[PDB]
Amino acid sequence: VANDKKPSDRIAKIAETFVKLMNGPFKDLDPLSIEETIERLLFILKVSRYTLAYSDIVLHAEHNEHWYYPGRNPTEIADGVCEFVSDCDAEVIETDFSNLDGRVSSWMQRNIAQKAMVQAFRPEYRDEIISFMDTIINTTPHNTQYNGCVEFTALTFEHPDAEPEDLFRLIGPKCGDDGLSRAIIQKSINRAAKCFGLELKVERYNPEIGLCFLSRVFVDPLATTTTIQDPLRTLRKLHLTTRDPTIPLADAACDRVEGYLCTDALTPLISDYCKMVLRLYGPTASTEQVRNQRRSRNKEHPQDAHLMKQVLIKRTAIDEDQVDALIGRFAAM
Amino acid sequence: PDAEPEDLFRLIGPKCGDDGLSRAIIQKSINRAAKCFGLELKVERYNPEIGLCFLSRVFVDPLATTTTIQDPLRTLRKLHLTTRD
Amino acid sequence: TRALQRAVIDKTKTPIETRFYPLDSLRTVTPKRVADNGHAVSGAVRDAARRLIDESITAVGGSKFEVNFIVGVDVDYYVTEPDVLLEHMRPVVLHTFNPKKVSGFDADSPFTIKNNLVEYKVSGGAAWVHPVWDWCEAGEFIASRVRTSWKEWFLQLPLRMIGLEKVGYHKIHHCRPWTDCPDRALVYTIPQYVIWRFNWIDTELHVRKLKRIEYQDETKPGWNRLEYVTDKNELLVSIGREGEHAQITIEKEKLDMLSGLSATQSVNARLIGMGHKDPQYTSMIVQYYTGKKVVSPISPTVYKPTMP
Amino acid sequence: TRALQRAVIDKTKTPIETRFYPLDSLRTVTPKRVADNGHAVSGAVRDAARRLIDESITAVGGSKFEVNFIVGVDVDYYVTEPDVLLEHMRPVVLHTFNPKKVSGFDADSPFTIKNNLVEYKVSGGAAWVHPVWDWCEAGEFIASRVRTSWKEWFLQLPLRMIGLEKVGYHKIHHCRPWTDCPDRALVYTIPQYVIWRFNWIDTELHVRKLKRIEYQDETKPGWNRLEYVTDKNELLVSIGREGEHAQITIEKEKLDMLSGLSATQSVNARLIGMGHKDPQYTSMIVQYYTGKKVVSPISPTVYKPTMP
């Protein structure tokens, strides 16, 4: 659903200041060769060749590590999240956007992303990048840029008397559709989204139900960095498999449970399901080398185990006796 | 619309008269193209449970085997009646 | 005559494309109303236009040479003629005043036309007395001079004695994006190339040079006439007495059918027949038909203070 | 001509900013009505204006030079010309009388205009007979002389013989804060800089010098004309016989459409067509159209005593 909601006059100066702060000290850049882009990490290649270099140079710089979390290993993500929650003393807010790529306006697209790319890249490459942006208007970096712009707008609205550089220095971790911010702008974020024309969903941090971030649940971010898959999103749908019909059910289930072990080995109410899938569909599945040579293969802390159990129960609103009964039923099947 | 016409056409899949094959990613957009030209199109998503229909031929398991049979839907309901002169 | 073939052979064309990326962002833009409600103010409209041109120039990635590439906003007075701006043969964008009404209220600043000059009197700012240089008339190709140093002037002196001149070409577009301020337009230009032209030879494409408009009607002295085009392919005419506030908009067809009448009584009867009952309309129509001349006085005016 | 470039090279500009903090508190202020009900009194309005300017000058932290920085309230008579106030090149704030009506009741003191002077007669206070120095007309830049000692006068004598003068520039704003007393305004000034000007050369910005207003209409002898702007972007005209009480306010458009008529009967018919039925209005309109001159008499007046 395309939208053409231009922002107000005042917000334009805030957006320009945010873009300039994003530029930082990297005035000049050069495009990457086709071979280097191909070995990095059709239609994706032509934009990737420039966008990967732009991200790696500007968005992964010294003065842009405060907010651009997108682009780091999951261990790095967990470390950053724990550091941010320690800094904010467990006072953080979560942002959940609905169809951001389908809702970003033309003015935002042509005044944030296009401006940033043109300022980052060399003048001799202006025509190619502008043509690529025009083709885009009619991937990953766009969401991060939108999140950074919205964070800058919120910070500018919260403290209009501070210098833009100091305001932007407080930008918290942001990664695409998910991000973190101070809880003091919980109500003012909705007005900023309305001014830009975006829809924002915000939820106050609650230790009883855990914290939601990148479909990951932090059981107790104050002390431990233990983290698990989001139970709210996956439990209601994990019993149904959305793989293509051509794949046997056993191979898809095996890949799903292998990923779950790789990410959620010691999570209550999921380990039992994964083990029962491995016990039932496991022997009936095909050879694992066969599925490793098949395209659809990629189409999918012990100390606080008690606390993780209680946090999962709070997340799923299931009584402990009910949880034990469910665990017994799952294991005995 | 942004790719070169030669590269676009190089992806043309098998086609034989009234029957043909295409990528499933344009399942919904094919109807609009037929409306623009003024033609009527009937499209069905591939389902391994019911097999694949092509040239009145049914592929039992095209993923592994190439075994194929006459279309059962078209012929079973009419095979008992003979349309000879 | 052979002069045509002579000039055609005398091409001397040197097209230049200095990576002047087309400003398609400025082109084909939906009109918008700046003010939320009521009506806008000259400052607000100017700020909106500046924002639009600034964001366009930022998106295209190029620079500009702002005058208190080339950009100018409400600088009709500051610029004696557009030829000085065009002689640089660079992209030029203007936010000028090319009214579709002979008089009335422009944005929030009332205006009137005395002689061929516009007695513009901004609500906030100095009153402007400047003409209009025929921007929005039919045609896309314009002829303009080119900057040349006095030394080059001396060099060409023998060459210009015969009647040779260096002429630049440009392409034109405007938008009229504000509905609340239709009298203002957003001119757009694109230089094409330069050639040498003989003074005493015509051109195929009927390229015109920007000229001062002649609003006065020789057939109706003391009156100013003007007509424009409408969204629904309608040709409306705006008329009013020179240096005076009143004006009226009417279809040129009805004005044509009225003008040839003989009796003012017949004029009034025909006006009544079409359902027009407003005296402010029929009386002005009759006044124009009879060509009544009145010596309008010059009286002091008391304006508002700007409310920023 | 080369005189333009000569003058431009002759800049001699010396801008001065003596920590003159902008009086933004005075600027962009919502209009207010001083009187609780009925109507205010000259003393009440003067007290309110004095309070406003005093609190503004206290907030800004600066001082003032009150005359019975620079501040003046209803001192149009006490000051022969505003140039004497402006020559100091210091911030100046005035509470003057710049009426939007030719005549009528000003605040609580009736007033009328004979010749180009205002026959102001305060309810409490001496009757004032002074002109108006064209304060609220279009434009923000003004030219005024500068104080110079007689010794400096002698020094410049040889320099002024050619036609050189020392000229100061200022920026302007007024507010008109009282709705019950619209005829009064709160002028605001800000000096900019000083330069040297040739007498026989023009200026780009059309800077004007304050001049006495010419209310009389040469086309309608014995009558005074005036017109102003309205909140809703309407251009209203106020007219009335000189040295006499009556006045009327009308849109300039209707007056324009009326003025060119030939028959008074037609004028009355058109007035009837617009729904205007008040004889006090139509009769005055007809009187102005026909330019009827009447020798108004001078009679003694009996005013009220001030009720403090």
Swiss-Prot record, chains C, D:
Compartment annotation: Host mitochondrion outer membrane
Region (Interaction with host mitochondria outer membrane): 146-163
Outcome when changing residue 128 to A: Reduced RNA replication
Note from the entry: The viral bipartite genome is composed of RNA1 and RNA2.
Region (Homomultimerization): 1-308
Oligomer status and interactors: Homododecamer. Forms 2 stacked rings of 35-nm in diameter, arranged in a crown-like structure at the opening of virus-induced replication vesicles. Interacts with protein B2.
Impact upon substituting residue 46 to A: Complete loss of RNA replication
Region (Capping) residue spans: 37-195
Role: RNA-dependent RNA polymerase, which replicates the viral genome composed of 2 RNA segments, RNA1 and RNA2. Does not need an exogenous primer. Also possesses a terminal nucleotidyl transferase (TNTase) activity. The TNTase catalyzes the addition of nucleotide to the 3'-end of plus- and minus-stranded RNAs, probably to repair the 3'-end nucleotide loss. Forms the open necked connection to the cytosol of the virus-induced replication vesicles. Mediates viral RNA1 recruitment.
Domain free text: The N-terminus is important for both membrane association and mitochondrial localization. It may also contain a RNA methyltransferase (MTase-GTase) capping domain. The C-terminus contains the RNA-dependent RNA polymerase domain and a structurally disordered region at the very end.
Coiled-coil segments on the chain, per record: none
Family from the record: Belongs to the nodaviridae RNA polymerase family.
Protein's recorded name: RNA-directed RNA polymerase
Species per Swiss-Prot/TrEMBL record: Flock house virus
